[PDB]
Amino acid sequence: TTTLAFRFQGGIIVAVDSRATAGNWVASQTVKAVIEINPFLLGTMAGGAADCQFWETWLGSQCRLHELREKERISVAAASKILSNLVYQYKGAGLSMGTMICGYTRKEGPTIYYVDSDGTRLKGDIFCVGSGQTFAYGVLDSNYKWDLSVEDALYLGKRSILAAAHRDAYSGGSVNLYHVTEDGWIYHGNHDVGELFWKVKEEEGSFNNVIG
Amino acid sequence: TSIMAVTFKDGVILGADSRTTTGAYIANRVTDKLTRVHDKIWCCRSGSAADTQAIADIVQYHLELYTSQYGTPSTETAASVFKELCYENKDNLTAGIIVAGYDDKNKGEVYTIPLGGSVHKLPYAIAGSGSTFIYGYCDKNFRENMSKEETVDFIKHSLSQAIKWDGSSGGVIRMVVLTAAGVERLIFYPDEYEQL
Amino acid sequence: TSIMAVTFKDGVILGADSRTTTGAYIANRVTDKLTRVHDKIWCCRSGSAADTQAIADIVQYHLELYTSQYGTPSTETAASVFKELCYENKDNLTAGIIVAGYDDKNKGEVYTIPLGGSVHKLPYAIAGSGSTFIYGYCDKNFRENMSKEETVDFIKHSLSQAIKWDGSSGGVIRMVVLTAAGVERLIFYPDEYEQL
Amino acid sequence: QFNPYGDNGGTILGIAGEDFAVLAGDTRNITDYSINSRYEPKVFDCGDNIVMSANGFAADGDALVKRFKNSVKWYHFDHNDKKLSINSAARNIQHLLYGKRFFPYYVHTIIAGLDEDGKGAVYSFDPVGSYEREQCRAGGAAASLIMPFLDNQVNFKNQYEPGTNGKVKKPLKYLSVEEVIKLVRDSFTSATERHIQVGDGLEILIVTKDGVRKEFYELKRD
Amino acid sequence: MDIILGIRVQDSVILASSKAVTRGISVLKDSDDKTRQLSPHTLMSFAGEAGDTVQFAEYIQANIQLYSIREDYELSPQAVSSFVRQELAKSIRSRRPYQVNVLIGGYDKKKNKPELYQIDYLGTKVELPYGAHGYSGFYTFSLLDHHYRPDMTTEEGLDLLKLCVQELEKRMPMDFKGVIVKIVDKDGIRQVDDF
Amino acid sequence: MDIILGIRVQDSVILASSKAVTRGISVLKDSDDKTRQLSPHTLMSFAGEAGDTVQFAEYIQANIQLYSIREDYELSPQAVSSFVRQELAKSIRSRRPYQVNVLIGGYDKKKNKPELYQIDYLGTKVELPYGAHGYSGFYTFSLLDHHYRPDMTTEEGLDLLKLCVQELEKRMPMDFKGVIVKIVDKDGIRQVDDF
Amino acid sequence: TTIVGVKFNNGVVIAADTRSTQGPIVADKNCAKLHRISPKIWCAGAGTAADTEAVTQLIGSNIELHSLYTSREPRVVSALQMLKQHLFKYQGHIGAYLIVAGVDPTGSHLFSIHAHGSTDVGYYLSLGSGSLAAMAVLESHWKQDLTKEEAIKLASDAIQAGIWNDLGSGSNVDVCVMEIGKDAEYLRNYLTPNVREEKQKSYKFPRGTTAVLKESIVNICDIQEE
Amino acid sequence: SDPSSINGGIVVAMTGKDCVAIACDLRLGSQSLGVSNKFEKIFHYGHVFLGITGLATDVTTLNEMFRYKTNLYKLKEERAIEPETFTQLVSSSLYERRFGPYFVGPVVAGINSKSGKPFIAGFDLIGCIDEAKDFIVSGTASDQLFGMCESLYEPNLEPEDLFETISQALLNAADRDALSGWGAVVYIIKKDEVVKRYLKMRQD
Amino acid sequence: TQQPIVTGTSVISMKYDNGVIIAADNLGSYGSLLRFNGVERLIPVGDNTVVGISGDISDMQHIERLLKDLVTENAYDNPLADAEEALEPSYIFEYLATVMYQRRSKMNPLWNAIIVAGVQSNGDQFLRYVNLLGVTYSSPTLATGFGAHMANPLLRKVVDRESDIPKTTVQVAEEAIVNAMRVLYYRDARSSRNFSLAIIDKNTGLTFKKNLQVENMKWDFAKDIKGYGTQKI
């Protein structure tokens, strides 16, 4: 698994891979490492598949209850903290989670919170989580700017996952893209790495070590 | 420890050595392993001294309370109470107990209760670390409906050998006779039983 | 395994069961544990089958070479060669061996060699996991200068009980008689010895 | 020390068609190198046009299926005999599995049926409740032998159209029920050859709008 | 987390705390503020196991803020430090203890004196002129033993603190990505934005 | 030790190696050269367990220098790399193996081509356009996958190397105190004194 | 694995299944477990495959040299003695479990060998993971004074018991008959009760289905003249 | 920790009508990290081909060792070694390291130059020979390869048909293994011509 | 979590045309010591069911009490207790199977392997297995412990599949069971010669046979076996 998320001029970009493994065995190439909690909130999934799925769909139930009771959209800060306070109760029991809670509100603007099964909760502009996180960081840090177009930012996120999919054995399958704006998130398609790699190589002139 | 109980014509006899050990040190050379849970229901104790004492004390309490309400309990009933304690607390106990008693209706009966907490009714029973060395002797020499004198000789000879080979067994040979006549205590010293 | 050797008036008799086990599976129910290291010097094997076979093969080699140079070896000499192997390789061996033989000068002799590699000359000896259950029986029933028929009955009855109680022991009872007359092999089947 | 888990072997396979769905599994039950039974059913009709199998440790598998069948029964009581949709069943099973997150059901669960648009559906679970809708999924002992074959013969992976040389992929044409059963039978025949825990018999449950049908085929008994 | 320092001068307390957050092989953040304001004239820095640190700090913060509202009064640094110690002393014999070390820097408005308290996860409290947690003290205490005076100014305290951070940046293996410095005095709490 | 990098461009091989030596809690040195010249047109960088690294490098150096004197001829980089691999492959089944990973950068004067070989302590050899040992590759290979060309100049190679070191300085937890960079080309070996 | 040995009137027969496994996976479906030590001394091996092969070849090699040295046909007890002393020396680390059988000038013989160096004598024996299934058949149907035809039947039936009931055993039945005063007959695949049924479909692909990057002729020939 | 699965990789071999085929992936890694996509695992000594999976240092070491031994064989025997003979040499060479083995999974493939008979064989890490008629598999995705080969394979395939069967067996097995892939090579071998084809596959 | 102390070995069984047969020896072992020689391990429940139990004997005696209590409880307020609402084999099994899985789930198992053999109301044969893990399965032949490895192969030669059941008579089935018990005495180091056998037929009902012995044993060939290889005398 490899997941990332970053803040920029046009909101937030969220990009994830699609591989799931059991040891060296590739169990699935078609998993959703991103969960849509609500039209304005996204959650990334890294670590234990079950732990992340279960508690993030649960998080969506809690966020829905909040806006029913308070007649107002939940803040990204409050949503992230519900999840972080929950996993802290289970600390030591063996939960395995590395997640980014991404969203946009009026009071906050575009916001990303890294939430962890160890109880860690961090606000930040850029995060990469998973076994291929280091590979994604390399591309992101060298090409990141605040003044990026939605088109260019989407590509950078897509490209950063590709970099990790290539090198990290436990990352791959396909790339799922999301763009989060003032008016909510927007899905930007499933991109098979088997086709994307050769496309990027030809067009970008990169990956000269590989032959094709 | 070498303990045994044997049914015979007139009732039942319990037998035991008198050695208690802490490793190789004999903490007590004159121990009484034949203990009373009711007038004519006794038991032989093996394993942990603490566990078997605690259990026997509880059983004596249960049978005293049984007697106050329902009259004299059967030997089977006494064995059941032992079993219930040994079986339900098997994880925390190290107790090998032989229950023996005399009714007028059922006469002499013997029940053995090993580590697991299982119950086995038998004509005679042997237990303790020293019993291993006399399985052969006891199987070959036991007869049903023996006399009192024959049964005393059988137990005396059997435990004599158990003591001879087992380091954890020794001292005097204590015996308790259970018949319609009453309760008789017997004792046999080393000079007597070693020369057999 | 239940093995024993008994001296008597005319010489010595070796006895053994025929069971070989791998855990609870009987790998061989008709094993021959009475093995020959010289014309009238045999041994009973207990413990590891591999170790005791390897040892016995080496001893037979040593005594064959002894005989070629110095003539017929004594039973004591054979026991010494066994001991030397068992003692010097005690860390890597699991072998409990009983050595028995017949001379004309010394008559029937029995030497037992337990795990450590120590040697003990005895009138009779018992060994193997099943021996534990017949220490009492054998001590009470052994006499010196028995007849051949009495000694066969003693071994038959003793191993019968050992087999009855020990799971690792069973099958047929093999026996080897060593006298001036020669070497006689005997066998006794379950239907015969179980009803004793 | 007491080990509360065991491994009863076996292998299962679920394939989703355009207007149907199949859930297959061998009928062999084992411990270590011994056979317990040559015919011990592993795939079950759970009602509401849903079939289910929980492969791995059979005691946990039987317990889970038993609890889900129970869940269907109470869903009818509590919600006016409403039909339990395949997606709703899947979510319910997640909560059954995660409910024992810290003492798991040691099973690979697969369910099959039709979605609310009438299209074939297969859902796959891990032991602690993570789930995902799939077109194709094998589970159990020989899952590693079967899945690659299905990637190739169901989703036409690594296959291209002749003459173009890698430029144009093989088009993803839909498969009939007769074509799917062929792939299932060949999958289990191949798995039986190379995996010792697979064999004896093959039982397939087919799900259509008309209901649940069964088909049985012999497998090698060595 | 890693390095937290504290120094008490004539008229103020200065706390320095690293900015790095490292979860395994990667540095996830380089601008993290490892501190919470407990009251207008009391600041607490912290370092220990992930999750526990923030959870504990915010829990203490909430309790002191509750006290302030209830009594309409600010607790003395000494009183706050004692409350914090008791919570950690309670925690160490719990099912799962808080694995958190803290420094408490406060200005006592009654006595007109700055005060620095060092408390570890066992609940071991000491009042000090200068303090540290973890491996920080191994490098910095020798410099502070030499250069420190009770009558130093705040500017002199910051210069002596720069000398400590420079030594840490030279001899420590981990890159802690600099420090956030905060001053606590009679006027309250403020952050030095250029360090 | 920690980070060692290598990149093969059009007409040269560039090796970058960290300067830090950390023995436990302290950084004992910040100017250490983790490399040895095996021959005029062959350079070897190294990283692994303390003591073993230098002992192994100097042992290899001595052997190649011996070969050079005996034959009055410089071995090809390919030949030197094979010799080194065999020594490590021999070493891994010894009583106490050499715990050393190396990069071998050389310019083949016969073929007029730069060559970079990566060898780990097991004796696993691979020829590469760019390589690394330890955790360095986890950060740097993604950048190199993107930016690298076979026809790059030495100056372009140094710029791409600066981008790698900048990423390492940003995301790695350990302070490796910068790198010593060395270029291997047709004219021999030289050190870039400003990096 | 299931291997058996059965004595009869004028000789001895051994048999084996043909399954080789790597954990739960079948590596080879038609493995040959019946090894030749000498022309009329054959053995069947269970346990570590490389060990049973290696130890059989070594002793078989030394037996051949011994036979040439002594100008005599090799004896089974010689093969037995050499095997057990080798295996004992290595303290069970050479995981070879063998059934050794053969005919020689002394007569017909049947032995088993355990990896630690112990040997056993018998009229009927079985080794391997399917030895219990096989021994159940042998203990039910064995008798004294078996004919050649009866012994082959009993042996193959014992192997079948292993094939069907033991997961470590399967596929076919190999047999070797060693009769006194005759050549030993090796009956490879004596029974074939596990043929795979016809597949439902052909998986032959259209030519050009696989994507290719580069083609090139490989020079396997030596350096050429002229 | 487990030496046979540090570097990763796979090899597969098949027989056809008057031909054999052997194929391998190109990946070399350090556990999760992919290091090289040009690490070929198939070597040839004359007309005998050898594929080796497992620990890469031992793969390289054994190739160098068998090159050494086959070159001496040729000088002394005055002829190239045959597949049947080479198979025995591999077995001998591996078993001499019985209690300190090379962590590898070799696969031999070739055609006997005299009889013309197609030949394949496989081994474990200590010498045991698996001489199959149909196919041999080895590597971290051996289970996957067994499943593909058992279903796709049929006897007496023509060279150009056999190429398709083995290529699809490898590709689809590699795509279900994390430590295999990053390219692939297939050798088609006839009695007096050998074709080598590099396959286009997904690079993740 | 515990360890078994006094244990019972194999229980074997099979179906035949009109019913089921089940058998088990009368031994209670204490490790390698063959301590108790009169232990009944087949426990009938009504006139249509027999429960055969192996493993820990103290736990067996507990289960024996549960079944005794089950019969008592079923009779309460039940006028058809000896007729339509009598205990079926399927009811008794499912109860035990429930208990076994519950006990394993509390990490405190009943250390047993159980086979419930019987005939249902409609005349159908019932034969199902359950153990300390709560694992259940059914088959024409079932056996526990060593019986699984040695008896099943022999019994499966008689009834290899479902279609072989109507073709198998009670005489042929009993013969196979008795032979299997002999084989286990030859080869199981924790078995006894004495055993009990039970037949449940849909026509003739429950026949419980006690004090059976293994007979017609082959041992004579032992006299010819000498040494371990080279020895001749």
Ligand SMILES: *[C@@H](O)[C@H](CC(C)C)NC(=O)[C@H](CC(C)C)NC(=O)[C@H](CC(C)C)NC(=O)OCc1ccccc1
């Ligand atoms: C990548 O991080 C990915 C993210 C998810 C959104 C898929 N996670 C995994 O791949 C993760 C790898 C970790 C645990 C090393 N895999 C799983 O969690 C995995 C998912 C299934 C679908 C393969 N499940 C798993 O490994 O089994 C849980 C288990 C196994 C055995 C017994 C009890 C529980």
Ligand SMILES: *[C@@H](O)[C@H](CC(C)C)NC(=O)[C@H](CC(C)C)NC(=O)[C@H](CC(C)C)NC(=O)OCc1ccccc1
């Ligand atoms: C012989 O079996 C005899 C019978 C008793 C009922 C008197 N048992 C012992 O002597 C017994 C043997 C040991 C191995 C259990 N010794 C003790 O129980 C010993 C007596 C005290 C007075 C020293 N207690 C003892 O060693 O305490 C530790 C302990 C506790 C429980 C179980 C084992 C050991």
Ligand SMILES: *[C@@H](O)[C@H](CC(C)C)NC(=O)[C@H](CC(C)C)NC(=O)[C@H](CC(C)C)NC(=O)OCc1ccccc1
């Ligand atoms: C009874 O003591 C009998 C006497 C032999 C001389 C026949 N011994 C055994 O049956 C013996 C008991 C075990 C506990 C040592 N069994 C074996 O030796 C057994 C025989 C083979 C043919 C299966 N071997 C065995 O279990 O190998 C492992 C081993 C090696 C050395 C020591 C213990 C165990």
Ligand SMILES: *[C@@H](O)[C@H](CC(C)C)NC(=O)[C@H](CC(C)C)NC(=O)[C@H](CC(C)C)NC(=O)OCc1ccccc1
């Ligand atoms: C059945 O007993 C059979 C007898 C053989 C003579 C064929 N045994 C096996 O097939 C055996 C399984 C168990 C007993 C080891 N298989 C192997 O030994 C196996 C064969 C080949 C096909 C791989 N080898 C193996 O798994 O190698 C790994 C290994 C590593 C170290 C030590 C031993 C084995």
Ligand SMILES: [Cl-]
């Ligand atoms: Cl006492």
Ligand SMILES: [Cl-]
């Ligand atoms: Cl023996």
Ligand SMILES: [Mg+2]
């Ligand atoms: Mg990848």
Ligand SMILES: [Mg+2]
């Ligand atoms: Mg016995």
Ligand SMILES: [Mg+2]
């Ligand atoms: Mg099969």
Ligand SMILES: [Mg+2]
């Ligand atoms: Mg390397």
Ligand SMILES: [Mg+2]
């Ligand atoms: Mg892959």
